[PDB]
């Protein structure tokens, strides 16, 4: 039962007890992944034109 | 001084947003008019409280905060609600139609039309501070907007700042107060493409809000209003060391270094009391022996699990109003040699102990009574994992028959990047049970 | 009309708690993987307790006790003994126990074992496991550990306790079984009912390579034991003949002799782990049956072997025990429209 | 600003669109001119969802009147609320369908079908932002049923990311114009399948039943089904022009309750309906009996037959909130075995403070029940009866169609039904 780094100020106190010792996708591969999903979109919505074309 | 961006991501985000704003102002003394009398650096200053808040000439203090929402009902609230005056109309953003519930709508059709805007008006936030942090996300888990918009908004935030830390304040979804059935496909999308983007998450369970408004308030139906006033009251409790003068949790960075020691488990769990009903005759005040002892009782948990049965890797308390080192010592100790109380071996026994002599500020006309001391406990079990096996298992059953899956091929996503995600909780699982089990 | 789901088809007990259910006519039960349930009749293995509690307006309730492997684990009872304070490791009702794997104790083991074969004790031990029927008596230390090694799991070795009470006639070991229902309350209800299991072989101290006389298992008797059947049916002797034999042999009673201190040593086992399995304030409420296994030696002294987590019963008291496990552990959470002795204690 | 453009087409949908725009009309405080008379900011907060705001605060309904004949559109023109409809709006021709689905869908009806989407154009081009359509019809006719079918799929063409929903009166032969209503009725199913978000299977005979059985009317009208129509189309469009965040959209709410693309098909409910023993107070519990008792619902088919795939229930009215979840999650947690168990808290409920005109509270039920197939399986006998026989098949051919065309819509819709029991079980 230790208690460490007692820091003190007006406002308020904090400390530290213990009780027992121890034992990313860049701006282009985001705009590839956007382009890609609206790319699908514009294939079904071709798919779906073509047909009610028909 | 460094400064926070606080981002507010669809409903559940700027609704709570608004709520934890309304109380920094209580706290710091602002007016709605962002005057604040007690500021006698007038246009500027390094406080804790500038962290923030920015200063005009004209001595308003400004949030350094940015709203986001696909649709304009709920941000339309924010502008002619009470504090309209303190956000200029650059920081709220609306878009004229929401995702629908649907992540894949948010993330790939809404999201990529909205995106460069948003970065542009929070580059306009980052340009005023002189050491930005960090940014804090507020969202929920199953919006189409909170989930879909927020995992893009994380990816660009890496790579916009990459330097930068990033907290999320993340709504899990509960069916009592939810009327979308495909919450649990929005929350695993969105866990799986924000997990490495973001270095300390805390989950707020909307039934845990629930029954403590019930139960503690006596609230027959809670409402939003109530969920929001109560979640403001613990995000306080959690950004207070960024906003006032103290030595413990003063940056975003020691939230990762105390709390975090594994990155992938990022998800502190969160315990407050006390949460006394105002409509009460007059409460007996509780000691800081109880109140801590509290800390320990499932049921004022932000997620309803049994650290019993896990195993902690930090702890931090918390503590607001009349506390002093000595009362904290005695209730630990006494609460060691009652409660079950297990760390890993690979982890000191120890918790880290802030007090701010402030007592938590309840907001007038509010549901919560006034209380002498509170506390907040952040802890890091593997019991919290239980929240992922409830939100993994519904995801398995209605994926099995691939039910609502269409809704979001048909916005572009791949129907890979489903089984993709819910790869990643199971291995997110298993990193848990690893870490806390025999 | 409440509603209960079933996990473990294997399990005779809850079998027939599932049939008196149905019988009263106000609960159905549903498919296995229902979330809609008011009672849960779960699996032995990784029953998933963290999805129970999250059903708005369902009080859920389950037949198990999250955290009671600790007490019906062979080297995990050890473990909570020596450790728990409120047992220590001076526990007077326990055999001396140590942990053995294939942290571990072979080294503290020894001394003790080397004690007593210096001071001419009677240094007979007992090598155990979870994962047996594999069971092995000796009193060579070589042989009890060079036994586990051959083997793959966590083992035990006891003190075996080589003066045990005989009947008689026949000079035969034996073993008590008790039943104790804990609620949700954390109410603690002894069984009026046990049994005990006898050998049907006369007790030999010179031959420790036969165990049909060295084990009481009902399985083991029926089938290496030949006297099977011949002094009570079954090998299963009840409470009231086992009360009169203590009267007109030991001039003494079975409550007086032996069931004080059973009831001393299921208080004493189950207060110690209510903290860490107490659902008094949890979003779910849990019950489970136990199955306590003790012995009994020639000075009336009870000795705790083990403790089971999903026992079995006896043939002959599967209805009324089980009808008691609906009055006191379900209809007491969901009302419709004693057997048991309460073990008070301090919460 | 969620606008929504809504459609009527034909006799029975324009007689039912009238009460429609009648019913909810009074409950925003609308009068037949158009004029708002109300006493509560409710009653606007989302008007324009489905009134155009026109010069002098006056309100125009955001609705397209077509038919093929003038007869009925000039009783909604001299009806109660005729004058509130926009003059232009009135699309119709002068030869009529004659019940004959090839006439309003290839040969009268593409006559017409232009005009008609010139004004649809007008109205879409005026909404800030438009959420999608809804149309009312009948299946069994001519121009509802063969024309409605195609404005649906034209509007498809020109608005492919906008929610399409539609009411649909479905045929019964207790309620019969003319016997080649399951022919006209089967056509158009198979373009609702692919062309349409969401429709509510309304069923004359389910709505006769009612009128006979339930509200006890000796002699029932087509007006006493249609005052059914009203009281159901008023309670399922009301998280629509009320406040709430359960359903607000349309896309939001069929996210929500279609899981499968094809299976689209709801049984509306309402509750009460009592008969002329009116006056006394319904309690949260009868509202919830009622509710999902199969007497109260409108698609004639047993639920108990199937399982739910996912239910929305609206409760109108002062009450008490907490009383309704208790209701609620007692009938789902007393009948789980109707619910599919693969599809979590698929029984979403929404609130709202206005009651319809002269009830204290009532509750609107809208079920996506695998039990509709009973629904397509009447309509798919009576279709092979006649046409096993090529029976009043010379209508049909005279105006260009082949029977192959008509081979083709049997399977279809054979195949709705198969998959409606693959799920069932
Ligand atoms: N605690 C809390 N939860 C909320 C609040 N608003 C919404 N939620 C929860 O958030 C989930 C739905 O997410 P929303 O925020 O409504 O969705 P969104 O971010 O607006 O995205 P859209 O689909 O485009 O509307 C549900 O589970 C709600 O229970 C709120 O104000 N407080
Ligand atoms: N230390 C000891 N001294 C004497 N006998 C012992 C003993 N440990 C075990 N036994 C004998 O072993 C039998 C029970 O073995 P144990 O309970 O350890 O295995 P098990 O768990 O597979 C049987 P059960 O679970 O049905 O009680 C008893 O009948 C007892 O006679
Ligand atoms: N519920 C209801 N059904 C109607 C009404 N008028 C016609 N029907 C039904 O609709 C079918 C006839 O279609 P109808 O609308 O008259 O044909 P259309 O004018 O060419 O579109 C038959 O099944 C009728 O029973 C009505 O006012 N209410
Ligand atoms: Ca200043
Ligand atoms: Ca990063
Ligand atoms: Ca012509
Ligand atoms: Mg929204
Ligand atoms: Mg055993
Ligand atoms: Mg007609």
């Given at each position: 039962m230790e208690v460490i780094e007692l820091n003190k100020c007006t406002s308020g106190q904090s400390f530290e007890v213990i009780l027992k010792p121890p034992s990313d996708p860049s701006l282009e591969e985001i705009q590839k992944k956007l382009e890609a999903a609206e790319e699908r979109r514009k294939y079904q919505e071709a798919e779906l034109l073509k047909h009610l074309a028909e | 001084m460094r400064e926070c961006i606080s981002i507010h991501?669809?409903?559940?985000?700027?609704?709570?947003?608004?709520?934890?704003?309304?109380?920094?102002?209580?706290?710091?003394?602002?007016?709605?008019?962002?005057?604040?009398?007690?500021?006698?650096?007038?246009?500027?200053?390094?406080?804790?409280?500038?962290?923030?808040?920015?200063?005009?000439?004209?001595?308003?203090?400004?949030?350094r905060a940015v709203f986001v929402d696909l649709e304009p009902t709920v941000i339309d609230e924010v502008r002619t609600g009470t504090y309209r005056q303190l956000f200029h109309p650059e920081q709220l953003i609306t878009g004229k139609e929401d995702a629908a519930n649907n992540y894949a709508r948010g993330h790939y059709t809404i999201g990529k039309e909205i995106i460069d805007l948003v970065l542009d008006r929070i580059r306009k936030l980052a340009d005023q501070c002189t050491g930005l942090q960090g940014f804090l996300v507020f969202h929920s888990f199953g919006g189409g907007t909170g989930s879909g918009f927020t995992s893009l908004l994380m990816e660009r935030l890496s790579v916009?700042?990459?330097?930068?830390?990033?907290?999320?304040?993340?709504?899990?979804?509960?069916?009592?107060?939810?009327?979308?059935?495909?919450?649990?496909?929005?929350?695993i999308l969105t866990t799986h493409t924000t997990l490495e983007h973001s270095d300390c998450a805390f989950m707020v369970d909307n039934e845990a809000i629930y029954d403590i408004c019930r139960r503690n308030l006596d609230i027959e139906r809670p409402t939003y209003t109530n969920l929001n006033r109560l979640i403001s009251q613990i995000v306080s409790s959690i950004t207070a060391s960024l906003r006032f003068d103290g030595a413990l949790n003063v940056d975003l960075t020691e939230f990762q270094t105390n709390l975090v020691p594994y990155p992938r488990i990022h998800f502190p769990l969160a315990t407050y009391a006390p949460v006394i009903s105002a409509e009460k005759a007059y409460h007996e005040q509780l000691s800081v022996a109880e109140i801590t002892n509290a800390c320990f009782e499932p049921a004022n948990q932000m997620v309803k699990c049994?650290?019993?049965?896990?195993?902690?890797?930090?702890?931090?308390?918390?503590?607001?109003?009349?506390?002093?080192?000595?009362?904290?010592?005695?209730?630990?100790?006494?609460?060691?040699?009652?409660?079950?109380?297990?760390?890993?071996?690979?982890?000191?026994?120890?918790?880290?102990?802030?007090?701010?002599?402030?007592p938590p500020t309840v907001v007038p006309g509010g549901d919560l009574a006034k209380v002498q001391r509170a506390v907040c406990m952040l802890s890091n079990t593997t019991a919290i994992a239980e929240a992922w096996a409830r939100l993994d298992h519904k995801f398995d059953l209605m994926y099995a028959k691939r039910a609502f899956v269409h809704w979001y091929v048909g916005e572009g996503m791949e129907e890979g990047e489903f089984s993709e995600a819910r790869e990643d909780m199971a291995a997110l699982e298993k990193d848990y049970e690893e870490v806390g089990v025999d | 009309?409440?509603?209960?789901?079933?996990?473990?088809?294997?399990?005779?007990?809850?079998?027939?708690?599932?049939?008196?259910?149905?019988?009263?006519?106000?609960?159905?039960?549903?498919?296995?993987?229902?979330?809609?349930?008011?009672?849960?009749?779960?699996?032995?293995?990784?029953?998933?307790?963290?999805?129970?509690?999250?059903?708005?307006?369902?009080?859920?309730?389950?037949?198990?006790?999250?955290?009671?492997?600790?007490?019906?684990?062979?080297?995990?009872?050890?473990?909570?003994?020596?450790?728990?304070?409120?047992?220590?490791?001076?526990?007077?009702?326990?055999?001396?126990?140590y942990v053995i794997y294939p942290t571990d104790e072979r080294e503290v083991f020894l001394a003790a074992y080397n004690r007593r074969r210096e001071g001419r004790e009677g240094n007979v031990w007992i090598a155990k496991s979870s994962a047996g029927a594999g069971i092995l008596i000796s009193s060579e230390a070589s042989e009890l550990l060079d036994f586990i090694d051959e083997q793959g799991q966590v083992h035990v070795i006891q003190k075996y306790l080589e003066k045990p009470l005989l009947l008689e006639p026949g000079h035969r070991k034996f073993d008590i079984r008790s039943w104790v229902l804990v609620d949700h309350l954390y109410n603690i209800y002894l069984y009026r009912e046990g049994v005990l299991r006898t050998s049907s072989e006369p007790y030999n101290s010179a031959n420790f390579q036969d165990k049909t006389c060295h084990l009481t298992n009902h399985c083991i008797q029926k089938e290496y034991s030949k006297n099977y059947g011949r002094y009570?049916?079954?090998?299963?002797?009840?409470?009231?003949?086992?009360?009169?034999?203590?009267?007109?042999?030991?001039?003494?009673?079975?409550?007086?002799?032996?069931?004080?201190?059973?009831?001393?040593?299921?208080?004493?086992?189950?207060?110690?782990?209510?903290?860490?399995?107490?659902?008094?304030?949890?979003?779910?409420?849990?019950?489970?049956?136990?199955?306590?296994?003790?012995?009994?030696?020639?000075?009336?002294?009870?000795?705790?072997?083990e403790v089971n987590g999903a026992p079995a019963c006896a043939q002959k008291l599967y209805a009324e025990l089980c009808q008691g496990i609906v009055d006191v552990a379900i209809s007491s959470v969901f009302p419709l429209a004693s057997i048991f002795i309460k073990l008070h204690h301090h919460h | 600003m969620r606008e929504i453009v809504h459609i009527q087409a034909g006799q029975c949908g324009n007689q039912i669109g009238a009460k429609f725009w009648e019913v909810i009309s009074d409950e925003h405080g609308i009068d037949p001119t158009g004029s708002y008379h109300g006493d509560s900011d409710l009653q606007l907060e989302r008007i324009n969802v489905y009134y155009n705001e026109a010069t002098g605060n006056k309100y125009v309904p955001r609705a397209i009147?077509?038919?093929?004949?003038?007869?009925?559109?000039?009783?909604?023109?001299?009806?109660?609320?005729?004058?509130?409809?926009?003059?232009?709006?009135?699309?119709?021709?002068?030869?009529?369908?004659?019940?004959?689905?090839?006439?309003?869908?290839?040969?009268?009806?593409?006559?017409?079908?232009?005009?008609?989407?010139?004004?649809?154009?007008?109205?879409?081009?005026?909404?800030?932002?438009?959420?999608?359509?809804?149309?009312?019809?009948?299946?069994?006719?001519?121009?509802g049923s063969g024309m409605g079918t195609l404005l649906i799929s034209k509007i498809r063409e020109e608005y492919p990311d906008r929610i399409m929903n539609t009411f649909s009166v479905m045929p019964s032969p207790k309620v019969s114009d003319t016997v080649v209503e399951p022919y006209n009725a089967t056509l158009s199913v198979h373009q609702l399948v692919e062309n349409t978000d969401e429709t509510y299977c309304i069923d004359n005979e389910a709505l006769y039943d009612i009128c006979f059985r339930t509200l006890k009317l000796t002699t029932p009208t087509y007006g006493d089904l249609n005052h059914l129509v009203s009281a159901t189309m008023s309670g399922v469009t009301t998280c629509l022009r009320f406040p709430g965040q359960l359903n607000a959209d349309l896309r939001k709410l069929a996210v929500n309750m279609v899981p499968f693309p094809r299976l689209h098909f709801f049984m509306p409910g309402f509750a009460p309906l009592t008969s002329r023993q009116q006056y006394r107070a319904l309690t949260v519990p009868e509202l919830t009996q009622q509710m999902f008792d199969s007497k109260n619902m409108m698609a004639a088919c047993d639920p108990r037959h199937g399982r739910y795939l996912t239910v929305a229930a609206i409760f109108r009215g002062?009450?008490?909130?907490?009383?309704?979840?208790?209701?609620?999650?007692?009938?789902?947690?007393?009948?789980?075995?109707?619910?599919?168990?693969?599809?979590?808290?698929?029984?979403?409920?929404?609130?709202?403070?206005?009651?319809?005109?002269?009830?204290?509270?009532?509750?609107?039920?809208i079920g996506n029940s695998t039990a509709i197939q009973e629904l397509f399986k009447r309509i798919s006998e009576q279709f092979t009866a006649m046409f096993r026989r090529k029976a009043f098949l010379h209508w049909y051919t005279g105006e260009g169609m082949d029977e192959m065309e008509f081979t083709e819509a049997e399977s279809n819709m054979n195949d709705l039904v198969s998959e409606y029991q693959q799920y069932q079980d």
């Open positions: - | 991501v669809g409903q559940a985000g700027v609704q709570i947003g608004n709520a934890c704003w309304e109380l920094y102002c209580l706290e710091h003394g602002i007016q709605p008019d962002g005057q604040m009398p007690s500021d006698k650096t007038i246009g500027g200053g390094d406080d804790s409280f500038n962290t923030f808040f920015s200063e005009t000439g004209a001595g308003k203090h400004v949030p916009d700042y990459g330097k930068k830390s990033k907290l999320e304040f993340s709504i899990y979804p509960a069916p009592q107060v939810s009327t979308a059935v495909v919450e649990p496909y929005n929350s049994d650290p019993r049965h896990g195993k902690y890797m930090a702890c931090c308390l918390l503590y607001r109003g009349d506390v002093v080192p000595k009362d904290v010592n005695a209730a630990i100790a006494t609460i060691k040699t009652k409660r079950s109380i297990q760390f890993v071996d690979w982890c000191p026994t120890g918790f880290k102990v802030g007090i701010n002599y402030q | 009309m409440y509603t209960f789901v079933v996990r473990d088809e294997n399990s005779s007990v809850y079998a027939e708690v599932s049939r008196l259910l149905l019988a009263t006519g106000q609960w159905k039960r549903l498919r296995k993987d229902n979330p809609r349930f008011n009672l849960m009749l779960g699996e032995r293995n990784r029953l998933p307790f963290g999805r129970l509690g999250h059903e708005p307006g369902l009080v859920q309730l389950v037949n198990y006790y999250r955290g009671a492997d600790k007490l019906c684990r062979k080297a995990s009872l050890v473990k909570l003994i020596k450790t728990s304070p409120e047992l220590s490791e001076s526990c007077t009702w326990f055999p001396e126990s009570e049916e079954g090998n299963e002797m009840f409470f009231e003949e086992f009360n009169q034999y203590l009267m007109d042999a030991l001039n003494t009673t079975l409550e007086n002799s032996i069931l004080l201190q059973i009831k001393h040593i299921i208080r004493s086992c189950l207060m110690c782990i209510e903290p860490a399995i107490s659902t008094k304030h949890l979003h779910y409420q849990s019950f489970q049956l136990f199955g306590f296994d003790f012995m009994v030696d020639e000075e009336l002294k009870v000795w705790l072997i | 009147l077509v038919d093929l004949e003038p007869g009925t559109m000039d009783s909604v023109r001299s009806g109660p609320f005729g004058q509130i409809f926009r003059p232009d709006n009135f699309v119709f021709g002068q030869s009529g369908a004659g019940n004959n689905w090839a006439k309003g869908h290839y040969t009268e009806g593409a006559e017409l079908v232009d005009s008609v989407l010139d004004v649809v154009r007008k109205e879409s081009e005026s909404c800030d932002c438009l959420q999608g359509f809804q149309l009312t019809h009948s299946l069994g006719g001519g121009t002062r009450m008490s909130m907490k009383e309704v979840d208790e209701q609620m999650l007692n009938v789902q947690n007393k009948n789980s075995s109707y619910f599919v168990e693969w599809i979590p808290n698929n029984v979403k409920t929404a609130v709202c403070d206005i009651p319809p005109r002269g009830l204290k509270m009532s509750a609107t039920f």
